[PDB]
Design a protein around this nucleic acid. Structure first.
Length: 77
RNA sequence: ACUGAAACUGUAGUAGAACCAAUCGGGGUCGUCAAUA
């Protein structure tokens, strides 16, 4: 991301990371996952500059859990 | 961890060249008409 910073009067630093749509799935090797903490991360986001909407994350979404190979899309004055 | 700013899709270019709305024609002149009984 190669933005400006209008109050700075100068370019913003280049922000590198992962684009939206990127997906990953893990086995949990140990420890319970707190549904309340997953909810909080799904609210606040992860990483840097989440205040302006970076870092927004979906946990355990059914679309990443589905098998879809057989499915189809739905059909003056 | 904070919207960039500012910038006329404008500039030049003749919908035109060529083509006859024309060719021929004396404002002239003579025999009947009609069908029954």
């Amino acid at each position: 991301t190669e933005s400006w910073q209008v109050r700075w009067g100068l370019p913003r630093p280049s922000l590198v990371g992962w684009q939206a749509g990127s997906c990953l799935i893990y086995d949990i090797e140990s420890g319970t996952v707190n549904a309340e903490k997953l909810q909080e991360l799904m609210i606040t986001g992860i990483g840097d500059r989440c205040t302006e909407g970076y870092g927004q994350i979906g946990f355990n979404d059914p679309l990443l859990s589905a098998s879809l190979g057989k499915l189809t899309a739905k059909p003056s004055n």
